[PDB]
Design a protein around this ligand. Sequence first.
Ligand SMILES: *[C@@H]1O[C@H](CO)[C@@H](O)[C@H](O)[C@H]1NC(C)=O
Ligand SMILES: *[C@@H]1O[C@H](CO)[C@@H](O)[C@H](O)[C@H]1NC(C)=O
Ligand SMILES: *[C@@H]1O[C@H](CO)[C@@H](O)[C@H](O)[C@H]1NC(C)=O
Lengths: 449, 449, 449
Amino acid sequence: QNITEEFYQSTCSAVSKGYLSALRTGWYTSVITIELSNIKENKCNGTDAKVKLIKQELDKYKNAVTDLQLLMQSTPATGSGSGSGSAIASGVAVCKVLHLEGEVNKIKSALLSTNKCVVSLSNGVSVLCSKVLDLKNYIDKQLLPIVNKQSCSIPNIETVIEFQQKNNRLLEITREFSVNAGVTTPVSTYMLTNSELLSLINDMPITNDQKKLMSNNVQIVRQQSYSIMCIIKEEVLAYVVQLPLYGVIDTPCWKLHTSPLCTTNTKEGSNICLTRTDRGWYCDNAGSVSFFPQAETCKVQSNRVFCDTMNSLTLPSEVNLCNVDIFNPKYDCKIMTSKTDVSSSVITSLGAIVSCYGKTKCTASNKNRGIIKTFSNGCDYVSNKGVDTVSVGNTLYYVNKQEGKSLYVKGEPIINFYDPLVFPSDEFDASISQVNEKINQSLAFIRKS
Amino acid sequence: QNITEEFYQSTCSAVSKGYLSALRTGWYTSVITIELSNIKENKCNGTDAKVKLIKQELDKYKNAVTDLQLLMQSTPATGSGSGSGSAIASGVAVCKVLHLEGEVNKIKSALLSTNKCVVSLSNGVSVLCSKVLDLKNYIDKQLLPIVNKQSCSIPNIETVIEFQQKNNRLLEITREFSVNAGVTTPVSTYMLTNSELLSLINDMPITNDQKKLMSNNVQIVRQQSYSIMCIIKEEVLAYVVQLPLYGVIDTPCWKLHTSPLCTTNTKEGSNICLTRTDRGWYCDNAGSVSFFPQAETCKVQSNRVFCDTMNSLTLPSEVNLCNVDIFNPKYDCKIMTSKTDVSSSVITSLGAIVSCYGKTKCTASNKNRGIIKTFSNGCDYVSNKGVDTVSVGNTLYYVNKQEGKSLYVKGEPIINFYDPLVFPSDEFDASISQVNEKINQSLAFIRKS
Amino acid sequence: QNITEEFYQSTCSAVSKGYLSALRTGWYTSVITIELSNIKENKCNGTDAKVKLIKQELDKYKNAVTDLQLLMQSTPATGSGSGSGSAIASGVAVCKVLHLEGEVNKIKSALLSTNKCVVSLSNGVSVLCSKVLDLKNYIDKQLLPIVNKQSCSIPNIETVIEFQQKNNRLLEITREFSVNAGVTTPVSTYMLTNSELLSLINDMPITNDQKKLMSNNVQIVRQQSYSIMCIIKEEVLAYVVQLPLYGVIDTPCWKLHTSPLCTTNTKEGSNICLTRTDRGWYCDNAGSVSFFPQAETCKVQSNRVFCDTMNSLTLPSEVNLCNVDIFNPKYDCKIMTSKTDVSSSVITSLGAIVSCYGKTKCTASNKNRGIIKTFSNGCDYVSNKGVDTVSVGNTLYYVNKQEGKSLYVKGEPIINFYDPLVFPSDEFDASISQVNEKINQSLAFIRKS
Ligand SMILES: *[C@@H]1O[C@H](CO)[C@@H](O)[C@H](O)[C@H]1NC(C)=O
Ligand SMILES: *[C@@H]1O[C@H](CO)[C@@H](O)[C@H](O)[C@H]1NC(C)=O
Ligand SMILES: *[C@@H]1O[C@H](CO)[C@@H](O)[C@H](O)[C@H]1NC(C)=O
């Protein structure tokens, strides 16, 4: 609920605390079926425009079914497979079951009397079935008596329009499945209406607090979901929707922000830099910390973070000590070094870190008062309380207007504890104790000779 | 207007000059409203197909409004926030104002008599208002007399069709806003027709030369714009369109192309490489140079470059001296080094740089004459005048057919001025003077022992 | 057909063999035309709803043509240009020909009598022409007699509906071309129906085995295609479709998987790591090996790999010896080193490599038996035969269920042949023989002093 920040002048890094967690750890597969009509082309003596329009829309239904047929002749399993495996792997497991004999018949039988069921497949997976569109009922009852005879009966213009409305959702689903090789993400309203999604959430074998969680963030749920095309078989079109399951909930999370920490010598060519690494989202997870390096693997909405553990890292709970004591031996606090003194800025949750070097004009202004702070050479921070923009050189960043308390922790910049001459000025991903050992090694290389 | 190129044999790099500039430095927010109809469901005795079709399309209007309602219950502010801040930050500032009382009433009053207005909000922002669709007028005048009574009146088939045409734009806007969590980019023709966009450009408080600039490049303007969902309130649907403002215009720009510069010893394992860094777009901006490292942050159309300063860098105007004298002390000309002699090629604006090493078959051919040039070991360049393709190994690159003059600047490759034994063969982002100091340091490590 | 795997305990890497190849080496351009109607607005005394609906849909046709007109006033050539050149370069060559006089007349004449032709342009390119929609015929025959007179004739509701159906494909094509600046990929069903694509494949001057190849993988073909907007001219709308040409077919391919290989000392701060580089897809191509570093540049479907040679590398056929003998001098087998002992896992084609270090809980379980293997410190591998998931820390990966034989090649991990004290613990992209020379250099730096 209450968001806070802490800027560490000593390491040129800030930590935004107070966020609650929702980590994806599992998948809920669910089958979405469309009852289709097995009709073959029935060309009849037809002339007046109502039969032509009906026959045209019927051909769009036929090409949509044959397009779905060449789509299932190839199950590419193209979703993920990026060394972290497939994400859709779980949903693919349901499609291989649907290809079994009698398996399309079980969901077709469970949905013989009701629209929404639960079906126990022949592999132990209890999936929830949904039937979102019924074209077999409409084509076999309202359309076949028009095209079945020798000469076509004249359908009313109302039938032509009602048939374009029902057939539309099928046509759009085949269009998405065609351009994406059967696997789509996010799940569009054609794949699942907000109304159908909320009905699937209410029926899940999950706690009521988790149903309130997923229902208040349906947009986040859509963006973290997959729609996988299954099978066209026995007057039934089936495709699987994989919805995220959040195994870690309401757990502490914080966000690390890092910026270069250089020396401010006036001699060009004589400055050395240092930047804490592993910036990003950290969350408590099962006695450890789940770290998320990729920026888009975590969507944040309203004080909670929605992450996917597929692309994360597991760190000891001691990783937090780099935020309070970077010189602490329980944890190997890693940095990267260079001699590149370029000014830059990072917009944090409650303020902005500014690393200003050289002649760069770094400043922070308010919309109505103008410039309220001019930064000197070095690394600094400013709160958003009273600040609107931060400009560094020719670049203007907008400060985030989130409410929260910020705390400035004064301290000596650690780049000053290093002798410039005996410094590793090209180490990437080096630990503090690792760098102290390389400094002990270059000073041993100068003492002996 | 006139595009030229310069290849530097000494550093294996080329510069494409002559481009004019258009840098995004600001945002213009504008409110786009849709007048809605506050109706509640009115189930009536209905049987004949025209009432059923009308009631179906009316339900799609109702679900679209409730879907927009759960979308504004969560303002995620998910656009950007990538350490450069939010891009949509400015547009979000307008949405927080719309949630104020009386604020939906001001734009609703300014648009009470005209379609397009200007409205001064209660926070000092003078936004331009547009009213693109009027469903309150259509539902309350043409539809309510059909559904208001006890039994429904029979609407003509013309009313059913005209209502599907007007309601369509609302349905597509909710579909885009649902899959993208309220923030879309680019701005589609459903969000804003080319006709409405041109009318917004003509009304902006900008110079006439800037209106000619944005109007001749509307496609670039759409791709650099954002559509942010605001509020559903008081029979008004409002969402903000953020259009780019180009503060830097008709300013000099050039593009740096770099390729590995290795030695051509015949001994495998004995070659060292060097590659100028910071390749990309450079533009004069306010006495400095704005450098763009990311490739997609700059779209080039017809001799002008359209960049976003949010992801750029500010460099001293002296950065140009790496293109004429890399050994010049006013600027720290940075390179990266390695021992990886792999052949490769870079398609420039007017030609192609080819770095050929080992047994790789590097060649450049014309469509009707065949191979017109065979490259030897080392780094070379060829103009597009008479050249169609360049093949390196099993890879074929197409040479850009842009008209312009190319200039070949002969010179000794600088990788030959370095003794291989005493070379830093793993430096990344190192300056020329930095490398000379490391060579002075490894030669001091061999002289003393 | 038969997929196999080989895990090398000595280098912590695995190779998935048995895949067949389809590399894109060329482009087939083809022109897709829409015959348009040159009509100007003809406002007439109109009141009853059928004329209003017709005039509304006619205005959507007019704005679509003018939107296409400002789209061709700017040919941005924004597709690619990423230093590998443009991909669309070949297709752009056809658009510059269409702007020639008489050139729209040749395809318009070849398609005067048939729907599908071949046309020899005035630049030697024999392109295949397709005419997918005929609006000039429909507007000039069925619509002009209604709007041509002084007062409008009353069209039937059937005409209003048939005109919305034909005009729809034009409107969707302008919507895609507007948001993407004239260059779209993949090619949607609006740009080309699966039926039109299959008819273009059958007519190509390619072998019958290649037509069977592209027809069985149309989804892969769409995802690797481009649609480029050409010209609006002389009652003809033309745009070019670039389809991939696979010059390398049924050639051997394998996939390299790599994972960190560290020492298992119990002392924190004392471990050194090593990881083979250049992981990805390798395919035999013209006596060499085409290597693909980017992960998305190769789509794999059903034992064959579909790669684009534009973003690839050419390696000596000897690159395979890093998979059997990394210490072999014919090839410089490159690695990268560090001191970062973080546990991680890689899902291979037939199993999973697990690098477990520190206190991380690495394990592999079966769905019904539970944990079937607990990994110790070091690098290991497990087959998918009997294994369902692999968990490392708080991350759970799904093992790929592809059928195939796996082979575990036991051997001493090479990180143990290196003395930790005299190790380059920050080399990136270093060769084995390069590292042995740096170890010979740091041992010479300690022997002399
Ligand atoms: C090297 O490490 C030893 C062990 O702590 C210490 O006594 C010595 O002062 C260090 N020398 C340096 C950091 O130059
Ligand atoms: C090292 O730098 C000094 C100062 O310019 C110079 O005199 C000397 O020749 C250099 N030695 C090298 C580059 O080996
Ligand atoms: C250095 O290389 C030489 C040449 O093969 C070899 O004899 C010597 O043992 C090496 N020394 C090392 C690897 O420490």
